[PDB]
């Protein structure tokens, strides 16, 4: 878990090899690439309540909002099970109005 102790980047595996008077290490490393731009937001206001992500980050391609993990990009529809609420949003800075989908209300119909 320590950064750059063995290999440059995130570390996956290593293989040892012998030498006449030494050792040789083959490190396997994971490197992200081909990034993009996105517009973020700290938290979502909805019906007077503030929602934060559980493990991820809110992004918006320009019209709609999604929650994605930090190191990879796969947008998912915002729900009430992958986010958590804590208090009303009147002191948080950067809030944006939007709606939060839930499965239970459409399910009960």
């Amino acid at each position: 878990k320590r950064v750059d102790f063995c290999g440059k980047g995130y570390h996956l595996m290593s293989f040892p090899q012998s030498a006449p008077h030494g050792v040789v290490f083959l490190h396997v490393t994971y490197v992200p690439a081909q990034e993009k731009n996105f517009t973020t937001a700290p938290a979502i206001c909805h019906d007077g309540k503030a929602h934060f992500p559980r493990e991820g980050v809110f992004v918006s391609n320009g019209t709609h909002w999604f929650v994605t993990q930090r190191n990879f990009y796969e947008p998912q529809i915002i729900t009430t099970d992958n986010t958590f609420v804590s208090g009303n949003c009147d002191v948080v800075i950067g809030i944006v109005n939007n709606t939060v989908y839930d499965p239970l209300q459409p399910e009960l119909d």
């Binding site: 690439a33 973020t40 700290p42 934060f52």
Partner: protein, 49 residues
């Protein structure tokens, strides 16, 4: 570990709190106190040196 990627400072600070076990909910409601404490501490250390 690669090319630099921009990020607002507040979200990076939230990640840093989330790393140590304190949830990110705490930081976002106490930004001013943290900023004031940080500034006072850095001024104090400058004066001490």
């Amino acid at each position: 570990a690669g090319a630099a990627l921009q990020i607002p400072f507040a979200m990076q600070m939230a990640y840093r709190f989330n790393g140590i076990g304190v949830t990110q909910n705490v930081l976002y409601e106490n930004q001013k106190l943290i900023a004031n404490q940080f500034n006072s501490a850095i001024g104090k250390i400058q004066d001490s040196l």
